[PDB]
């Protein structure tokens, strides 16, 4: 039964029609009826034989299932392609999602549903348009596919084809009276996607078909979207739309020139100067209607440079490349605004090249502004803090100095990010809980790298007090990892991950300085993880007792001087003396260990299995609980 059904599924995955011509034949009626509709899990996906047969595009097995058995054609299943897993699928949806036209024709001709959506409300027409084939979309439309049906994220049939760049598909869709003035959750109107993907033909087709040139939710028209992504051709096409007025034309030219200055793919600074100069000429082309530039406060992050107001100023920086980068940053931040999504990415990149040419001061200056802009947008800042840790550790490795206010600012940003990550983890149910937990652990490790770097610098008294205040503000929250490790537990752990890029040179765990700083700031020295190990348990469980004997010596001394119990028991009921894997660490801990008659009595009670529950005082109910 189950084994034969699995064999049927395995053969139908390869489309072995002759194998299914015996595995599902010469039987009774109801014995194989369940087998035809039996979902089989394989490769991390769940599907019926019809669904996987249409996914692999084998027309013979699908035709035999649709003719000689009359299997119901609205079955549900999962999706392996499109980068993710989509449930609630359909045989027709899986067939149209790969371009197999004959199985789609057979399914529609024998009773499948053309509008059978998924968990994301993706109609089969959307899958066929995402694949890009035109004939299947034509047939599916001719069989009443309801071309105006959107998805869960409101991406209609036209927008996905416009983004993917299938000009024949968008031409046919606009031919069949689709909705060119569509909308989405982000406000994209099927022309923002084409401009973002930089497809000149689809933009031309949508313009010819009376598109709506309307600003989306993020405050960016498709013209400004194209200028944001350095797409000169899309800007040139959208700029002759005869309704762009004059302010938006010069704004588009300024944004395009600004984006060309610090885009990794399209870096061309001559193009930047010339587009900015064209914009300035168009501004200064009228005697009495000089479209004077909006005044901007001089941001300290860009060397206190202001935006150029006249072409006389722009002629003086045509050869100042390190000033043209700042001009591009200033212009695109004025145009896109501080709250836009795509502002932080160039600011990081212009930082990164400054990090490449051993010029880390301007790198920190740009990256801190990028971090602040990304922070006051509730975006994801887990990677920017890691970049800060890497650049700080590369500064320390090359015998350079790190400014203490910079470390204080990065530590404050990291603490705020860890707070937001805790809120996100405790708020998300199942969508990206693994991703959120991994980001949380990465943020915690980044904070530990930053604390190690702060210990490796020289800071003033007020700056050290600010750093310790931020560390204490984090510690009072008591962050935890997957295993329950606190900050001290990882700071005394040799198994704490350190990224290979430019942090192994400085941030080496376990680190005596980090442990002492955490204990002085007020870390829970008696804290335990889910396994029950204390910080002392982790540090005596160490494999380099001679190589960094000073480090182990200082960490054990600091842990016992902070007031940790030296005979605490984990979930396996092991004292740190027994957990000590090396003779040197055990000897050193035993020297540090001071006996207590209370500890001896508690250990005697735990060994004798005395019914101490509800008998000894409540505090001693905890004490005996871990000896």
């Amino acid at each position: 039964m189950e084994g034969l059904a699995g064999y049927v599924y395995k053969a139908a995955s390869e489309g072995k029609v002759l194998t299914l011509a015996a595995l599902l034949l010469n039987r009774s009626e109801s014995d194989i009826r369940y087998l035809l509709g039996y979902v089989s899990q394989q490769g991390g996906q769940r599907s019926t034989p019809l669904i996987i047969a249409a996914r692999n595009g084998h027309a013979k097995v699908v035709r035999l299932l649709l003719e000689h058995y009359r299997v119901q054609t609205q079955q549900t299943g999962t999706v392996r392609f499109d980068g993710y897993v989509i449930d609630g699928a359909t045989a027709l949806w899986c067939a149209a999602g790969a371009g197999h036209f004959e199985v789609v024709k057979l399914l529609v001709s024998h009773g499948a549903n053309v509008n059978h959506t998924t968990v994301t409300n993706s109609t089969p027409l959307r899958a066929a348009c995402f694949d890009g084939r035109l004939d299947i979309v034509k047939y599916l439309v001719e069989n009443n596919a309801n071309i105006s049906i959107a998805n869960k994220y409101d991406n209609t049939c036209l927008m996905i084809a416009a983004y993917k760049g299938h000009t024949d598909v968008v031409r046919y869709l606009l031919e069949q009276r689709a909705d060119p003035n569509a909308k989405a959750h982000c406000g994209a109107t099927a022309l923002h996607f084409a401009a973002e993907a930089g497809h000149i033909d689809i933009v031309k087709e949508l313009i010819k078909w009376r598109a709506a040139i309307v600003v989306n939710g993020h405050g960016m028209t498709p013209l400004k979207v194209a200028a944001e992504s350095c797409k000169a051709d899309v800007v040139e096409l959208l700029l002759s739309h005869a309704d762009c007025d004059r302010r938006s034309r010069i704004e588009a030219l300024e944004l395009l020139g600004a984006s060309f200055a610090n885009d990794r793919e399209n870096y061309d600074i001559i193009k930047t100067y010339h587009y900015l100069y064209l914009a300035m000429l168009e501004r200064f082309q009228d005697g009495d209607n000089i479209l004077e530039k909006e005044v901007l406060p001089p941001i300290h992050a860009y060397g206190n440079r202001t935006e150029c107001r006249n072409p006389q100023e722009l002629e003086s920086i045509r050869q100042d490349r390190d000033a043209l980068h700042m001009e591009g940053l200033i212009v695109r931040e004025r145009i896109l605004g501080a709250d836009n999504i795509d502002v932080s990415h160039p600011i990081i990149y212009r930082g990164a090249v400054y990090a490449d040419n051993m010029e880390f001061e301007q790198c920190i200056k740009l990256w801190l502004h990028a971090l602040h802009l990304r922070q006051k947008g509730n975006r994801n800042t887990h990677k920017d803090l890691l970049r800060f840790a890497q650049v700080f550790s590369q500064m320390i490795h090359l015998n350079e100095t790190v400014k203490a206010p910079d470390i204080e600012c990065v530590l404050r940003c990291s603490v705020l990010e860890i707070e937001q990550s805790m809120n996100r983890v405790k708020n998300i149910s199942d969508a990206d809980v693994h991703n959120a937990m991994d980001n949380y652990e990465c943020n915690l490790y980044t904070f530990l790298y930053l604390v190690c770097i702060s210990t490796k610098t020289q800071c003033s008294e007020e700056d050290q007090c600010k750093i310790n205040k931020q560390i204490y503000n984090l510690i009072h929250l008591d962050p935890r990892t997957r295993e329950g490790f606190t900050l001290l537990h990882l700071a005394v752990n040799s198994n704490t991950p350190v990224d290979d890029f430019h942090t192994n040179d400085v941030c080496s765990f376990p680190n005596a300085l980090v442990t002492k700083l955490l204990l002085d700031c007020g870390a829970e020295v008696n804290a335990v993880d889910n396994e029950g190990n204390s910080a002392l348990h982790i540090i005596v469980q160490y494999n380099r007792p001679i190589s960094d004997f000073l480090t182990l010596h200082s960490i054990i001394i600091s842990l016992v001087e902070a007031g940790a119990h030296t005979d605490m028991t984990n979930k396996q009921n092991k004292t740190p003396l027994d957990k000590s894997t090396t003779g040197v660490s055990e000897i050193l801990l035993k020297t540090q260990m001071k006996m207590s008659l209370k500890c001896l009595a508690a250990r005697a009670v735990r060994a004798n299995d005395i019914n101490y529950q509800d008998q000894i005082p409540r505090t001693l109910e905890e004490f005996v609980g871990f000896h």
Binding site: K16, V17, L18, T19, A21, A22, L23, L25, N26, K60, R63, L64, E67, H68
Partner: protein, 68 residues
């Protein structure tokens, strides 16, 4: 004589028939299908399915070969 063992036998027979039939060994495929039908004495279901799902030439040969 008609148990699961010979069932797996002619299952493999028609599997090789499919493989060599897509590869073009139509005489080998029709011989293997003859060996497959010569164990189950009344496969009416396959008698009707292979009249439809098979290509017209291979079953045109096989149906004539069945009296032989």
């Amino acid at each position: 004589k008609d148990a699961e063992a010979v069932q797996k036998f002619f299952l493999e027979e028609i599997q090789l028939g499919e493989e060599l039939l897509a590869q073009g060994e139509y005489e080998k495929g029709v011989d293997h299908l003859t060996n497959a039908i010569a164990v189950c004495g009344q496969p009416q279901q396959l008698l009707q399915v292979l009249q439809q799902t098979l290509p017209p030439p291979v079953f045109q040969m096989l149906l004539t070969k069945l009296p032989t």
